[PDB]
């Protein structure tokens, strides 16, 4: 079991900023190998045989190290380079994979695009009722949501769901869902989705007015 540690676990760099990473092992290996993983995809070979760049890998990319300590460097950050990187060894069976580093890119802040939608007919006609609310395309990730109904926010039955940095815009989105009984929702009228970001001193919100 040559167990491999990569550090750091996470990191957000700015374009042109320097980057070094390590699959660091409990025992000597002959070669360090590295992969890059980008959301929804299978890994791609990145550096092989410790230092030989893989197919379609930029020369700003290099790999190195020795025995128990190996490295992956990004000379100067580039937006395309963002992904999860996994080091490791095929020295001693069993082959083992590094703990990973999740490299995100630093870009221009962007106010999240908040949207709110009332319970459709069908669901409501299905006997249900729940109010969705996307918080599209923002940066950085760190953002808190807080529903509100008739003045009181909403803790219970609130399940949120982020994504990781989009490939096409380098931003983040969140999706809080407020679910409630068909019968319940009719006991309130104004449901408001509240967004907390560094792009806004105030909690940007959205909201509708229940009607029949």
């Amino acid at each position: 079991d040559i167990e491999l540690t990569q550090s750091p676990a996470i990191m957000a760099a700015s374009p042109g900023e320097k980057v070094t990473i390590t699959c660091s092992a409990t025992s000597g290996v002959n070669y360090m190998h590295w992969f890059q993983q980008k959301p929804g995809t299978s890994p791609k070979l990145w550096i092989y045989s410790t230092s030989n760049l893989a197919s379609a890998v930029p020369a700003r990319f290099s790999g190195s190290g020795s025995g128990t300590s190996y490295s992956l460097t990004i000379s100067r950050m580039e937006a395309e380079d963002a992904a999860t990187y996994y080091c490791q060894q095929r020295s001693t069976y069993p082959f083992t994979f590094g703990g990973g580093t999740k490299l995100e890119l630093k870009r221009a802040d962007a106010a999240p695009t908040v949207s709110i939608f009332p319970p459709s007919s069908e669901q409501l006609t299905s006997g249900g009722a729940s109010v969705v609310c996307f918080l599209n395309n923002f940066y950085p990730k760190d953002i808190n949501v807080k529903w509100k109904i008739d003045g009181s926010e909403r803790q219970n039955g609130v399940l949120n769901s982020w994504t990781d940095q989009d490939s096409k815009d380098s931003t983040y989105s969140m999706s809080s869902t407020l679910t409630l009984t068909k019968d319940e929702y009719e006991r309130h009228n104004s449901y408001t989705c509240e967004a907390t970001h560094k792009t806004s001193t105030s909690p940007i919100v959205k909201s509708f007015n229940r009607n029949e």
Binding site: A54, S55, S120, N136
Partner: protein, 223 residues
């Protein structure tokens, strides 16, 4: 085009048996080793083991973590790779990748370069239920970029297919990762098209549940 295709993935009762498949093409199977790797939702990659080539007796290596429980093999008749899974635990729930390992030559520039898309495996007795799909329609047309959504609630297990206008709407699509709640998953699908496409061109949200075999299109109604 070197192609690798894993099937077999689905839900599996705990302690039960699951056989993972993986079709191959564009290379000479028997000449190439083939590992097996897996990744659990939101985590790190885990090497499960390979199987050598013809000139190396098709000898199987494994991971101690999975030794005695998993056997790797391959039908050399029609170049496929397998993975036998026994006494499966929730912690084997993941998505499994067949990868072309080293070969009878020196293209080690290759070796571990070609992966498949991976197949997802969910270890649980837990019951299978298709989803209910509903259109997230706004209220009070404004905003040059009007955003509509798809609420995919009440299905099991993962995954589900969601794309817009029979895949025509790839741009500005926002499908979220499911949330597990009460042994149940839910996600949404947001798209930001202009007024020109909608609600004029008509926008559809085609949802699918491979498991419960649930394919449905929600006509995003203007309201």
């Amino acid at each position: 085009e070197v192609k690798l295709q894993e099937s077999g993935g689905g839900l599996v009762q705990p302690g039960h048996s699951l056989r993972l498949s993986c079709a191959t093409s564009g290379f000479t199977f028997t000449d190439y080793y083939m590992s097996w790797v897996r990744q659990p939702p939101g985590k790190a990659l885990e090497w499960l083991g390979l199987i050598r080539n013809k000139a190396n007796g098709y000898t199987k290596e494994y991971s101690a973590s999975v030794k005695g429980r998993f056997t790797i093999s391959r039908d050399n008749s029609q170049s496929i790779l397998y993975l036998q899974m026994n006494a499966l635990r929730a912690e084997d729930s993941a998505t499994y990748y067949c990868v072309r390992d080293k070969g009878s030559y020196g293209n080690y520039e290759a070796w571990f370069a070609y992966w498949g898309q991976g197949t997802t495996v969910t270890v649980s007795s837990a019951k299978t239920t298709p989803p209910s799909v509903y259109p997230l329609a706004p209220g009070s047309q404004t905003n040059s970029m009007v955003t509509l959504g798809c609420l995919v609630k009440g299905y099991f297990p993962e995954p589900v297919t969601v794309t817009w206008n029979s895949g025509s709407l790839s741009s500005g699509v926002h499908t979220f990762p499911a949330v597990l709640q009460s042994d149940l998953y839910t996600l949404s699908s947001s798209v930001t098209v202009p007024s020109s496409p909608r609600p004029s061109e008509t926008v559809t949200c085609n949802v699918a549940h491979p498991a419960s075999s649930t394919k449905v299109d929600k006509k995003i109604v203007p309201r």
